[PDB]
Amino acid sequence: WTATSGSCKGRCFELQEVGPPDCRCDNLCKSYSSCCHDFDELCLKTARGWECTKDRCGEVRNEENACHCSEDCLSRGDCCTNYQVVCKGESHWVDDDCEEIKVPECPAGFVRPPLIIFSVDGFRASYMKKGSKVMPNIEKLRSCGTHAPYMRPVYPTKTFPNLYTLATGLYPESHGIVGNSMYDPVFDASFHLRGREKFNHRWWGGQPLWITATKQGVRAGTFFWSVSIPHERRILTILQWLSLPDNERPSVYAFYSEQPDFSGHKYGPFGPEMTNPLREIDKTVGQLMDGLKQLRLHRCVNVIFVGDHGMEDVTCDRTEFLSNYLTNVDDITLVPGTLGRIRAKSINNSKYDPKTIIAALTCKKPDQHFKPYMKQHLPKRLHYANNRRIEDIHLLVDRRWHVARKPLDVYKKCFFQGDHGFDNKVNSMQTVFVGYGPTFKYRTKVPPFENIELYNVMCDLLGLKPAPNNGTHGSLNHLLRTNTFRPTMPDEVSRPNYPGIMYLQSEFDLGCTCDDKVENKLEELNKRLHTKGSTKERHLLYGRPAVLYRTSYDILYHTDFESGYSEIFLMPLWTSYTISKQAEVSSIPEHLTNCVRPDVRVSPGFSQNCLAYKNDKQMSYGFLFPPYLSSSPEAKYDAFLVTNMVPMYPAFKRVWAYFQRVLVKKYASERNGVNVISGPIFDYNYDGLRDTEDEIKQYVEGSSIPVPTHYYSIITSCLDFTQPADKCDGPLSVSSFILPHRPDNDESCNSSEDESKWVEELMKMHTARVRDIEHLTGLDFYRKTSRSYSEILTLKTYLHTYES
Ligand SMILES: *[C@@H]1O[C@H](CO)[C@@H](O[C@@H]2O[C@H](CO)[C@@H](O[C@@H]3O[C@H](CO[C@H]4O[C@H](CO[C@H]5O[C@H](CO)[C@@H](O)[C@H](O)[C@@H]5O)[C@@H](O)[C@H](O[C@H]5O[C@H](CO)[C@@H](O)[C@H](O)[C@@H]5O[C@H]5O[C@H](CO)[C@@H](O)[C@H](O)[C@@H]5O)[C@@H]4O)[C@@H](O)[C@H](O[C@H]4O[C@H](CO)[C@@H](O)[C@H](O)[C@@H]4O[C@H]4O[C@H](CO)[C@@H](O)[C@H](O)[C@@H]4O)[C@@H]3O)[C@H](O)[C@H]2NC(C)=O)[C@H](O)[C@H]1NC(C)=O
Ligand SMILES: O=C(CCc1ccc(OC(F)(F)F)cc1)N1C[C@@H]2CN(C(=O)c3ccc4[nH]nnc4c3)C[C@H]2C1
Ligand SMILES: [Ca+2]
Ligand SMILES: [Zn+2]
Ligand SMILES: [Zn+2]
């Protein structure tokens, strides 16, 4: 109930929320059906429009006007945004040359530059260049301030997940808004755009910027705007809030525009009808900046121009129907469109089986435009699994397509030429970032980055301590003139052991064999030096990774590679080796095909054994340092140590071997050497975080050898590729992957063909950030370079996306 008999007199867009049943006057009151009787009359005036003209200059103040051109309007804070231009001979902000803001220039009483976030729905990155001729104000922000060529949204590339990610710094799986539509089985409740459930606070996890500010005593404007409130009125309300007295005035503000998303769904991303919405946005920016000039705040406020996602070409005719694949289409519930989520229609049908649904959906049609996954097998870069609201079965839809249950769902619910939601590495889904103000750099371009990183910077711009989030604090310091946050490396938790030769061969009983009884201080003091780490500076280029948890591990040195060998998981956590541009690929000699050799530095009881792989008919083994890249016949024997061995499914060995025999050499040729770090990952509970020993769900049969869920590699070289990887004086370049360790290649529909046609395509789909690997392993990389730590953090967040 709302007794809406109170009055908004003197309260229009008040900042406190008055509780039920007393009526409200805040910018959300419509959406809650709770406004006071006179809200429209007093708070949403429209008389005479939004601009001053010549003949209003110095008028008599009349309070019914939407905005004023009277002499007292600056005092009152309520002039039309163009008042000084028309009535006092001033220029529009956009017509002024830009001049560096080297220091804030704020009026008396401003404790800190305010932040204004100007958010635009569906603003595709390529609009900044392709629309620049009709967007002069936005183009001046971009060229004068700090801009990226694009910003990467989160998955799914929908509005609510992305706007709440911007506000919290968290992945959707962590903040809880995993879609525009959701079912929560614990609550037994549904979230939708139409209805009242989406208001309940229980959907909304984490801590958004406006709460963070409030708890730390920085005042915030209200971020949400009811769709009927026109843009011009949104802008004037922000400016009115900016003339409030010092003790009452917010320091952070948001504007939001439904455009150009709205028009983009109807007309497609580059439909001729899209020029007009882009003009309109620019005009709105122009009003804000002119309004800031009038208040003397245009060299004081930091402004962020930011989008939630892009837009792609999508039509009704490009729909796949689950009814053309499944027999029992009526026993499922599908969340449809640019992504697919499937669960059982009824909780009381135990003739529901995901395995059979998946299999009926896997590589069934030659051109099939979606690919089914169990959520834990989705590429780890999407971070889209660890929430009860994400259904176990997921369909990743190709760009330009939709998935639906049956054809009647499409025509009886074409009407649209654009949509969004696809994989967040797709170029059409990329969106924008520009920062302009005293705290941002002047005429600076920065590389593309992820929207999960912005919360930290918005906290820095306001002097706030960010709540715990998924950004890497410091990774965006190169956007800022000052207010940098100066991070320190985490402390290493476990120190390694450095074992020497401690065991005789006969103490081992591993069931392994090797034809190595083939037999001098010349070549012998020399191989001893190799076991104490004489070549370690060639192979470990950025220092040893640090172990950030408690555990027991050994550093092992070899001529061609170095490892950190876990006595608990019985395999390396990491294996590091450098492959120069001149290196040669060899084969495994015929006598050495099944060679595995005990390591006399490591005890029997902390070693794998070959009997277990013999008895496990499902499981085979591979090596982390590849024998194919040994520097000499004699060095090759090191590559067959039991301490370099890791469990691999025969199907995964096809992928692994091709990566080791062909691609590493190819990368070395192309990048002028590469340093490689490889190893395993255990993430059985799909939370993106390393599993502890007591959480392992699968072992090589009859043994304590744990089976990895994934295998990673980090591949590093010199950004200036005229220098070799191992003698690089400047910035680095990296790419990485986290491959799923799976017993089949069902993910790859061409996998019966030669590896040269499908392996690299799988690896690109499972591209990753070094940071992603950090979370999954509890390791910390690049500890000893000559680069600044901020730069290294930027490198660790880089994602190689293989879009052109
Ligand atoms: C991305 O960044 C995020 C954020 O940093 C990372 O997410 C964090 O990861 C932590 C590890 O997974 C996790 O720690 C948990 O916390 C449990 C308690 O947490 C509740 O409180 C949180 C804080 O809110 C308060 O914030 C400020 C302080 O900062 C206060 O002033 C306020 O008063 C606030 O209340 C809260 O965020 C959290 O919310 C989740 O659940 C809500 C409702 O269900 C949602 O609204 C919201 O979206 C959150 O949902 C996500 O996170 C939960 C996991 O918490 C997840 O299940 C959902 O799917 C969703 O993804 C909580 O309400 C604490 O109980 C945990 O401790 C157990 O484990 C330890 C291990 O050391 C045990 O030793 C300990 O005994 C304990 O075990 C007991 O429970 C076991 C399992 O139930 C049981 O078997 C056992 O026998 C024991 O009884 C643990 O510390 C953080 O909560 C989490 N934060 C967020 C926001 O997600 C994330 O990892 C990053 N991602 C990557 C890839 O890096
Ligand atoms: O008022 C706000 C956000 C305030 C905000 C701003 C910045 C912000 O970010 C930051 F915090 F960083 F500032 C957070 C919240 N909203 C009201 C809107 C209603 N909506 C849709 O009807 C809609 C729109 C596009 C679609 N395409 N397909 N379906 C769609 C459905 C989306 C909404 C969000
Ligand atoms: Ca885990
Ligand atoms: Zn949107
Ligand atoms: Zn949209």
PDB file of C-alpha atoms in Angstrom, residues 497 499 502-503 507-510 551-554 556 564-572 597-609 641-645 693 704-706:
ATOM      1  CA  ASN A 497      63.283 -27.905  -1.116  1.00  0.00           C
ATOM      2  CA  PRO A 499      67.025 -32.101  -3.306  1.00  0.00           C
ATOM      3  CA  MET A 502      69.399 -39.339  -2.352  1.00  0.00           C
ATOM      4  CA  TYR A 503      68.069 -42.662  -3.693  1.00  0.00           C
ATOM      5  CA  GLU A 507      64.925 -48.698  -4.055  1.00  0.00           C
ATOM      6  CA  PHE A 508      62.241 -48.014  -6.683  1.00  0.00           C
ATOM      7  CA  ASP A 509      59.518 -50.463  -7.544  1.00  0.00           C
ATOM      8  CA  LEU A 510      57.490 -48.458 -10.076  1.00  0.00           C
ATOM      9  CA  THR A 551      52.462 -27.157   0.719  1.00  0.00           C
ATOM     10  CA  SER A 552      55.533 -29.311   0.253  1.00  0.00           C
ATOM     11  CA  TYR A 553      57.432 -29.058  -3.064  1.00  0.00           C
ATOM     12  CA  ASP A 554      60.852 -29.489  -4.671  1.00  0.00           C
ATOM     13  CA  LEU A 556      64.206 -29.718  -9.904  1.00  0.00           C
ATOM     14  CA  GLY A 564      58.409 -27.162  -9.092  1.00  0.00           C
ATOM     15  CA  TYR A 565      57.461 -30.752  -8.177  1.00  0.00           C
ATOM     16  CA  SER A 566      54.583 -31.243  -5.657  1.00  0.00           C
ATOM     17  CA  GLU A 567      55.144 -34.086  -3.201  1.00  0.00           C
ATOM     18  CA  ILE A 568      51.383 -33.908  -2.411  1.00  0.00           C
ATOM     19  CA  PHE A 569      49.918 -34.069  -5.979  1.00  0.00           C
ATOM     20  CA  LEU A 570      52.920 -36.199  -7.195  1.00  0.00           C
ATOM     21  CA  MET A 571      53.521 -34.022 -10.255  1.00  0.00           C
ATOM     22  CA  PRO A 572      54.845 -30.572 -11.163  1.00  0.00           C
ATOM     23  CA  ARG A 597      62.825 -43.385 -15.488  1.00  0.00           C
ATOM     24  CA  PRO A 598      62.902 -42.995 -11.667  1.00  0.00           C
ATOM     25  CA  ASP A 599      64.234 -39.686 -10.366  1.00  0.00           C
ATOM     26  CA  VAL A 600      66.984 -40.303  -7.808  1.00  0.00           C
ATOM     27  CA  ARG A 601      66.263 -36.878  -6.190  1.00  0.00           C
ATOM     28  CA  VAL A 602      62.725 -37.830  -5.186  1.00  0.00           C
ATOM     29  CA  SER A 603      61.604 -40.727  -2.976  1.00  0.00           C
ATOM     30  CA  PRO A 604      59.595 -43.770  -4.212  1.00  0.00           C
ATOM     31  CA  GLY A 605      56.796 -42.839  -1.825  1.00  0.00           C
ATOM     32  CA  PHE A 606      56.477 -39.330  -3.430  1.00  0.00           C
ATOM     33  CA  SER A 607      56.671 -40.585  -7.053  1.00  0.00           C
ATOM     34  CA  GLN A 608      54.099 -41.832  -9.624  1.00  0.00           C
ATOM     35  CA  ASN A 609      54.386 -45.419 -10.934  1.00  0.00           C
ATOM     36  CA  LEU A 641      61.765 -38.796 -15.683  1.00  0.00           C
ATOM     37  CA  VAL A 642      58.754 -39.990 -13.723  1.00  0.00           C
ATOM     38  CA  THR A 643      58.790 -36.497 -12.165  1.00  0.00           C
ATOM     39  CA  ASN A 644      57.949 -34.907 -15.591  1.00  0.00           C
ATOM     40  CA  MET A 645      54.977 -37.263 -16.207  1.00  0.00           C
ATOM     41  CA  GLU A 693      43.977 -32.079  -1.685  1.00  0.00           C
ATOM     42  CA  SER A 704      46.869 -41.480  -5.187  1.00  0.00           C
ATOM     43  CA  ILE A 705      47.749 -39.838  -8.519  1.00  0.00           C
ATOM     44  CA  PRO A 706      45.117 -37.062  -8.943  1.00  0.00           C
TER      45      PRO A 706
END
